[PDB]
A paper describes a structure:
S-adenosylmethionine (SAM) is the principal methyl donor in cells and is essential for mitochondrial gene expression, influencing RNA modifications, translation, and ribosome biogenesis. Structural analysis by cryo-electron microscopy demonstrated that SAM-dependent methylation is required for peptidyl transferase centre formation during mitoribosome assembly. During translation, peptide bond formation occurs in the PTC, predominantly formed by 16S rRNA during the late stages of mtLSU assembly and involves the folding and methylation of the A and P loops.
States B-D exhibit a mature CP but still an immature PTC, which remains bound by NSUN4-MTERF4 heterodimer along with an array of state-specific factors, including GTPases, GTPBP7 (states B-D), GTPBP10 (states B1,2) and the methyl transferase MRM2 (state D). The states B-D, with an overall resolution ranging from 2.8 to 3.62 Å, allowed the identification of bound factors and conformational changes in rRNA and protein elements at the maturing PTC. In state B1, the CP was completely mature and dissociation of MRM3 dimer was accompanied by reorganised rRNA helices. Consequently, H89 and H92 are immature, and PTC loops become disordered, blocking GTPBP5 recruitment and monosome formation.
Author numbering:
A (entry chain 3): 94 to 188
B (entry chain D): 62 to 276, 286 to 297
C (entry chain X): 87 to 243
D (entry chain d): 40 to 54
E (entry chain 9): 14 to 135
F (entry chain 2): 47 to 92
Write the structure that this text describes.
RNA sequence: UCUCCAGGCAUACGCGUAUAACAACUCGGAUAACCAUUGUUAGUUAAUCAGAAUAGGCAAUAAUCACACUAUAAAUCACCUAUAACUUCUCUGUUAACCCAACACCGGAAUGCCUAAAGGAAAGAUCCAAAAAGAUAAAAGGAACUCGGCAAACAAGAACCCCGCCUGUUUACCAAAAACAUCACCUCUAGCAUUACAAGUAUUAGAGGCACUGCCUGCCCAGUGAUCACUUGUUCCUAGGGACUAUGACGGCUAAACGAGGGUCCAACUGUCUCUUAUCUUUAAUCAGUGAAAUUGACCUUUCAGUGAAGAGGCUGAAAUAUAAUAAUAAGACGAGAAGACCCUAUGGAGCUUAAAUUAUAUAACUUAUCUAUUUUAUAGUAUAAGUUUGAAAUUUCGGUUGGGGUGACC
RNA sequence: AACUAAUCCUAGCCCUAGCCCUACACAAAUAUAAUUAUACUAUUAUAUAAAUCAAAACAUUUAUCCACUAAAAGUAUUGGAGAAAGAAAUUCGUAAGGAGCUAUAGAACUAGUACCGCAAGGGAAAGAUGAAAGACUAAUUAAAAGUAAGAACAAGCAAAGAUUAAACCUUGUACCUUUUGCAUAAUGAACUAACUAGAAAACUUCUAACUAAAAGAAUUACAGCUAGAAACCCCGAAACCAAACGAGCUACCUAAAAACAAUUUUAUGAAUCAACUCGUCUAUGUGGCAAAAUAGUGAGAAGAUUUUUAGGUAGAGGUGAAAAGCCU
C-alpha cells in the first residue's frame, strides 16, 4: 500500500479490490464465489447453485478492504434505478 | 606513439634499420602471440617486379649481372644483389645462382616456347609447360607473391587460350594470365627444412617466444537417446 | 535510439535497438545557383523534392526546422541572396535565361538585409555583428579639434 | 593493521 | 612523495631539464651548438651627465607641496595644441588635412618610439 | 621480499604522468582540473 | 697517543638547505657530551665540466687487439650538387652525513676507479644467577638420538630405486616440484599486401597437442577369374532394361646424461645420543637516563570434599591463615592476540562449467525487399529494413523432508 | 591548604524573504616537463544513463532520480491487471525575519591548509585577561576520571544489620543482554567528560463549534459535520552499476644502453668459483633491524644472462615458459 504518494501525498486505492468487491454504504462488502466459472461439468447441481450467489465479507475482511480503498469508494451514490438501492442500509438490527 | 618503421618512400639498396612490434598492435595490445625479442636486424629492400626498365630506357629485354649472393636474415631464402645499367637492386636468388653470372629479364612474349636458363624472368606464356617456376604473380605488374620461400617451386601445368594454370607448393592450382612474368627455377636454400634448432635458446634468438601453459558436434534431438 | 521487446511481447526481455536511415548519395542541380552538388540524401528527401517540383523550390519552401540541416540552410541563404540582389552572375551573357529563373522564383524574394541573417547560428551571427561594429578608437586629438572648432565657429557666428 | 597520526603543533605560548 | 607545493625551477630535475630565471635573451644559438651574441639585443643604459644638477634625493620640509592634479589628455591639448589652432583660426589658416602641422601623427609606424604598441621599455 | 618502496622517484616520469600538459591532453583530464579548481586546491596538478 | 674493525672517493637518478659559523638549551636525537634540533647570519663564481639555415643526389662488404681464423643469431650525421649568411660569451646546474622504506630503519639503490693513502668503533657503569641465544673444546662409545643422520662433524667419499629427457620457468609474503617451458615429432587453419602477423608468401604464418630416437606395432588395403571378364556396389528408366564403378589413434622404451626433486644403502664423521660438562660473548641481574604493547566489569583475588552444563578463588560443609616487596617456575584463571578449522542456516553473495531458463544488429552467413548498374526477363552487387541459421557473449537461478554422503525416494 | 584540570562568548554558521547578472583585478610571466619574452610537432564534448533497491526470489515492471499553485482525484486509465504507476477536460489565484546554532554545536573550514595517497582523491584539530599591558596577563572552582597529602595489618562481589568500637560477629552465588520463565554459563564494558536511537492521522477514542445540516468554492451526510489533541527508531555487510584515476611496484613488450675477474674445456643455454642474480634447508626473530629481515647453508654466474633509462598495453580489461600468477 502507498501510504503517502510522491506527487500528491495521499493514500492510494488498490485496484485489485475495486475490481472484485462491492461496498454497501453500511459497511458490508459483496463478493463472488471463487471457481464459479471453473470446471462446471464435474460440479453437482447443488454445488453450482451455491457458487452463483453473492456472498458477504467478515469483520476482518471488511476491515482489510477498508484499509485498501480510499474514502471516495465509501461515499453515497444516488444512482437512479440502482438494483442495490435497498441494500445500502441496515434495518431492525439491534447490536 | 606507434609509427611503423616502414616509412621510406624511395627505394635504396642500403639496409634500413627495423623496429620489431613484439606482436603488439598500433594500440599496444598483443594481436599475435609468441613474437618478441631476437637479434637486431636490418631490412634489405627487395624488388620482386623483375622486369622493371631503368629510367629513360626502352621496355625491351635486358640482362643484369649477379654481383653477390648474400644471406638475408629477414627471409628464409638468400637474396642476391644484381647490378645492371646504372642501378643496383636486391633480388631473390635461385638455387644454383652464383656470383658473376648474367641473368635475363625479358618482357617480350614469344609465340614459340624457348628453353630458359635458371633465373631469367620470362612471361608464363613463353615458358614451356612443366618448367619449374617461382616468384609467380597473380596479375602482371603486381610483383611476386607466390613461391618466394626458400626451396619452393611451381609447375606450369597448362597454357590454354592465354591462360596458365600453376600448381602452387601447397598443390593448390591457380590460374593467371600468360602475360604474368615468373623467373625459372626453385628458390635457394633448398635445405631449410633439414635444419635442427637443437636448443631452446636458439628459437629465442629468432624471436619465437615460449607458448602458454594453459591446457565438437551437436547431436540432433532424435540422436540424444543413442548417446 | 530506443528499446524493443524480443518477439514483440512485453513479457520477454528488453533489448537495445537503433533504427537507421538508408542514406544515399546523389547529384542535384540548383537552378538559382547553377551548380551541381553531391549530397547524402534519403529517399524521403527525394520524394519531398519531387512534391516541391524542383530542388530549388524544396530548399526555399521548407522551414528551418523541417529542413533539419545546416548545409541546407546555407543553400537557403545563397538562393535567397541570389534572388534578393538579382545578381548578374547567374548565367552571365544570357540575360534571357537569368530573367526566367528569377521570375520563376519571384514569390520567395525578400529584402536583402533580412536574407543575410538566414541560417546563421548564434555564434556565427555574433561573429558577423562583432565584425560589423569593429572600429579602431578615434584619436582624441581629432575629437578635441572638432570640439574646439565648433566652439570657435559658434563664438564667431 | 591501520594507521593514522597527529602533528606535534609548534604551540608558541608566549602571550 | 614529490613536493607539489614548491616552485618548479631549473635546480630541480635531471641534467637535461633547464629553464631561465627570467633573464632576457641577448643572442642566438646557431647550428653546431655555437652561441652568437647580438650587440643590439644587449640593453644599453643611457646615463645623463649630472654635473651642475641642482636636485637631490630629499626635499626641504619648508617647501610647500601643491595640489595634486593628475594630468589628463584634455589638459595637455589645451596647453600645447589649442593656442596654435586658436590663433590660426583667427588668421583663417587652418584646414582638417594639415592637423599634422600642429604635431598630429596619423600613424605610429615610422616612429622610433611607437606609442602603441609600445616598442620601447621603461 | 620487503615491500613499501614502490615509489621510485623520477621527475620525467612524474611530470609526464600527472603533469599540466598531460592533464589538458584529454577532456577527461581537463575535468579532473575543473573539479580541483572548484574545491579550492592549492595545486591543481604536478 | 694507544687498541681494534674493513667498501671507500667521485658520477648519474633522487632530495631541496639536512651544508658552514655563531647564539640559545623549550622541542628533535629514542639517554648524555655534542648537535643532525631552535633562531640569526652566511653559502655553490665555468667559452674547457654539465644541460638547452634551405633543396637535391647516393651508400652490397659487422664486431671481437681485426691480421690469420672461421662461424651464425647476420650485427653504428658523413661525402658530394647548389642557394643563403660573412668574426661570437649569454642563460642554467654546481652545498650536505643527502635517496626509497611513517624512523638517525641489521632492508633496497646504477656506473667509474681503487682496497686502505680512504672509511670507521662491537663495551653508559656494574655484575656472573636461572632460563634463552651464539661460539669453541671432549674420557670411552660412534647414530645406540630421531618421523628422518634434522642440526653438527678432525667427514664432504660410493653405489641404488622412482620421477622428469637436459639448461631453463612458477604461486612477491607458508608449496621451486614429479608441475610450466623446452628442442624434435604430430594435428588443424589460411593462396595473400601498404599499421600486428608482414614490408612476409606453404621449406611460410597462426592455433593446439606431445620428450625425442632405432624397434615391435593399429585397423585400412571390392570379390572371383587374372593387364583382362563376371558377380557385386551405386544410380536412374520402368522385375525387366540401361548408366557407372582400373600400416598410422598405438605401446614398450633408447639410455646415457643432468637434478638445492621423492625415497633408500655402505663408508667416514661426529655432543645427535648413552650423559652431560667447561670457558667466552650475548641476554639477564644491580646503579644512572629514557620510556612502549597486547590486556583490564569490579576485586579485600586461598586449600579440600560436595553440587554443577566433561565445568568452582567467590555458592554449600570442613580446614588453613600477621603485613608487604625482589628473583624464579608455567598447574589454573574454559589465560590473551590472528582475516585459521569444523557441521548447519540465509527465498545473502561472487568465480568457474555447461546437456539449466531467457535473450543475443560480436561475427559470419544466406532469403525477400529497398537500391545502382546492366540485358528481356536476367544475373549482378547493397550506407537499409524484415526474417531464418549458427553463437563471442550478457542476465538471472540454485524447492522441501529424509541423524552427514552418493542412490532410492517421498511432498 | 593541590597537581592534572574545569569555568567562559563571539568567531562564524543555518533556514527564509527580497534580488538574474554587468568583482573580468597594477606591471611581468604561464598550455613548453603551466606560470621559461620569438617560429620546429599545429588545435575540437556525447549515440538511449546504468544499477542498486521493491515485487518478502527473480526474468515484464519498480514514484523521485528523469514545466504554474488548489480543486476534479488517488477519479478515468496503466500494470508478471501483482507490487505499483497515474492523467486530462474543466474550474480558482493582483503576493527584512528567526518558540535557528554558540567551539565534540553551526559549514569540512582558523583550511580545502597541515597531513595521507604515484594519481584520481580523502581530510583534520584548535580560541578565550582588562576601560587601560604606554596598567610586570587576569580570574574563578570541597568540584570528573588520575594522583598527592596519608602503603599495608587473619576472613573473602567488599556491602548490609549492626555496634561503645574502622576491621573480627551474622546475612549475602557482579551487571546487562541472552538463552525456557536456570546460570558457577556465552556475549559487551579499564575509568571520566561530552555526544549517541519511535517520525506520519485511513479507522478508532477524547474535547469542543454549528446542527438536517456542517465546511472561508469543488467535500461529506437516513445525526451528521468541522476543528483540536492523540502514531509507527539506531548502527553494521559480502556485493551491484556509472565514470574518472593508476604499469615509477609487478607481468609482458618496444627503443636506447651497460656489466661479466681467474681457471679448465674447448669452441659451449659445458665445468670450478667471485662480483652479480636467485631464495633449497636449519636456526633466530615474531609490535621483530624487517607489514618477510638477520646468521649460516645452498642454486645459477657468456646466457632463455643480469642491470639502467624513457616509452606502450587498464578493469566487461591488461599480462601470463597457467601459480586462476600478477596489475602500487
Ligand atoms: Mg602441454
Ligand atoms: Mg530491467
Ligand atoms: Mg606505500
Ligand atoms: Mg624499479
Ligand atoms: Mg651543521
Ligand atoms: Mg658550539
Ligand atoms: Mg630509533
Ligand atoms: Mg641550525
Ligand atoms: Mg662543456
Ligand atoms: Mg658535490
Ligand atoms: Mg660503541
Ligand atoms: Mg656488556
Ligand atoms: Mg667443534
Ligand atoms: Mg665429546
Ligand atoms: Mg632411518
Ligand atoms: Mg644435513
Ligand atoms: Mg626437470
Ligand atoms: Mg633447472
Ligand atoms: Mg608460495
Ligand atoms: Mg627452481
Ligand atoms: Mg620455498
Ligand atoms: Mg630440485
Ligand atoms: Mg656405518
Ligand atoms: Mg627484571
Ligand atoms: Mg633503570
Ligand atoms: Mg591486601
Ligand atoms: Mg587476602
Ligand atoms: Mg581451590
Ligand atoms: Mg572443586
Ligand atoms: Mg567454599
Ligand atoms: Mg598457568
Ligand atoms: Mg541477483
Ligand atoms: Mg526483490
Ligand atoms: Mg538469492
Ligand atoms: Mg566544528
Ligand atoms: Mg570539523
Ligand atoms: Mg579529583
Ligand atoms: Mg567480615
Ligand atoms: Mg571487555
Ligand atoms: Mg540498516
Ligand atoms: Mg617503466
Ligand atoms: Mg614472466
Ligand atoms: Mg669471464
Ligand atoms: Mg625469483
Ligand atoms: Mg655450483
Ligand atoms: Mg650445475
Ligand atoms: Mg655457465
Ligand atoms: Mg594448474
Ligand atoms: Mg594494491
Amino acid at each position: 500500500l502507498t501510504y503517502c504518494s510522491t506527487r500528491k501525498g495521499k493514500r492510494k486505492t488498490v485496484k485489485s479490490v475495486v475490481h472484485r468487491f462491492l461496498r454497501l454504504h453500511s459497511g458490508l462488502w459483496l463478493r463472488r464465489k471463487a471457481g464459479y466459472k471453473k470446471k462446471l461439468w464435474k460440479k453437482s447441481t447443488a454445488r453450482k447453485k451455491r457458487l452463483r450467489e453473492f456472498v458477504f465479507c467478515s469483520k476482518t475482511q471488511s476491515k482489510l478492504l477498508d484499509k485498501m480503498t480510499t474514502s471516495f469508494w465509501k461515499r453515497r451514490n444516488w444512482y437512479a434505478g440502482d438494483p442495490y438501492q435497498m441494500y445500502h442500509d441496515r434495518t431492525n438490527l439491534r447490536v | 606513439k606507434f609509427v611503423s618503421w616502414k616509412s621510406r618512400t624511395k627505394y635504396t639498396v642500403k639496409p634500413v634499420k627495423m623496429r620489431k612490434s613484439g606482436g603488439r598492435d598500433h594500440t599496444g595490445r598483443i594481436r599475435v602471440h609468441g613474437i618478441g625479442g631476437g637479434h637486431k636486424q636490418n631490412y634489405r629492400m627487395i624488388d620482386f617486379l623483375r622486369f622493371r626498365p631503368e629510367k629513360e630506357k626502352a621496355p625491351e629485354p635486358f640482362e643484369e649481372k649477379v654481383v653477390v649472393v648474400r644471406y638475408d636474415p629477414c627471409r628464409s631464402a638468400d637474396i642476391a644483389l644484381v647490378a645492371g645499367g646504372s642501378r643496383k637492386r636486391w633480388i631473390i636468388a635461385t638455387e644454383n645462382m652464383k656470383a658473376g653470372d648474367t641473368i635475363l629479364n625479358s618482357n617480350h612474349i614469344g609465340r614459340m616456347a624457348v628453353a630458359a636458363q635458371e633465373g631469367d624472368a620470362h612471361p608464363l606464356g613463353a615458358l614451356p609447360v612443366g618448367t619449374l617456376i617461382n616468384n609467380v604473380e597473380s596479375e602482371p605488374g603486381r610483383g611476386a607473391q607466390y613461391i618466394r620461400a626458400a626451396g619452393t617451386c611451381g609447375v606450369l601445368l597448362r597454357k590454354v587460350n592465354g591462360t596458365a594454370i600453376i600448381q602452387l607448393p601447397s598443390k593448390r592450382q591457380m590460374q593467371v594470365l600468360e602475360s604474368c612474368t615468373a623467373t625459372v627455377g626453385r628458390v635457394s636454400n633448398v635445405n631449410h627444412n633439414q635444419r635442427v634448432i637443437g636448443k631452446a635458446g636458439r628459437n629465442r634468438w629468432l624471436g619465437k617466444r615460449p607458448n602458454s601453459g594453459l591446457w565438437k558436434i551437436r547431436p540432433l534431438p532424435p540422436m540424444k537417446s543413442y548417446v | 535510439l530506443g528499446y524493443r521487446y524480443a518477439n514483440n511481447d512485453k513479457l520477454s526481455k528488453r533489448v537495445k535497438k537503433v533504427w537507421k536511415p538508408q542514406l544515399f548519395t546523389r547529384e542535384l542541380y540548383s537552378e538559382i545557383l547553377d551548380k551541381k552538388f553531391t549530397v547524402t540524401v534519403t529517399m524521403r528527401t527525394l520524394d519531398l523534392i519531387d512534391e516541391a517540383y524542383g530542388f530549388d523550390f524544396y530548399i526555399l519552401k521548407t522551414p528551418k526546422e523541417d529542413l533539419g540541416s545546416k548545409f541546407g540552410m546555407d543553400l537557403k541563404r545563397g538562393m535567397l541572396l541570389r534572388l534578393a540582389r538579382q545578381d548578374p552572375h547567374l548565367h552571365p551573357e544570357n540575360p534571357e535565361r537569368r530573367a526566367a529563373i528569377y521570375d520563376k522564383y519571384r514569390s520567395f524574394v525578400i529584402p536583402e538585409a533580412e536574407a543575410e541573417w538566414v541560417g546563421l547560428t548564434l555564434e556565427e551571427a555574433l561573429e558577423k555583428q562583432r565584425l560589423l561594429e569593429e572600429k579602431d578608437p578615434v584619436p582624441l586629438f581629432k575629437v578635441y579639434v572638432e570640439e574646439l572648432v565648433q566652439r570657435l565657429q559658434e563664438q564667431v557666428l | 593493521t591501520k594507521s593514522r597520526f597527529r602533528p606535534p603543533t609548534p604551540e608558541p605560548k608566549y602571550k | 612523495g614529490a613536493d607539489r607545493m614548491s616552485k618548479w625551477t631549473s635546480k630541480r630535475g635531471p641534467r637535461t631539464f633547464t629553464k631561465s630565471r627570467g633573464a632576457k635573451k641577448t643572442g642566438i644559438y646557431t647550428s653546431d651548438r655555437k652561441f652568437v651574441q647580438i650587440k643590439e639585443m644587449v640593453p644599453e643604459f643611457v646615463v645623463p651627465d649630472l654635473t651642475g644638477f641642482k636636485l637631490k634625493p630629499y626635499v626641504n620640509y619648508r617647501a610647500p607641496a601643491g595640489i595634486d592634479t593628475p594630468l589628463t589628455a584634455k589638459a595637455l591639448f589645451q596647453e600645447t595644441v589649442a593656442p596654435a589652432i586658436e590663433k590660426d583660426f583667427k588668421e583663417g589658416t587652418f584646414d582638417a588635412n594639415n592637423l599634422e602641422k600642429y604635431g598630429f601623427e596619423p600613424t605610429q609606424e615610422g616612429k622610433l618610439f611607437q606609442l602603441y604598441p609600445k616598442n620601447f621599455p621603461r | 621480499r620487503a615491500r613499501g618502496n614502490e615509489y621510485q622517484p623520477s621527475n620525467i616520469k612524474r611530470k609526464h604522468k600527472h603533469g599540466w600538459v598531460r592533464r589538458l591532453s584529454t577532456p577527461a583530464g581537463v575535468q579532473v582540473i575543473l573539479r580541483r579548481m572548484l574545491k579550492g586546491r592549492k595545486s591543481l596538478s604536478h
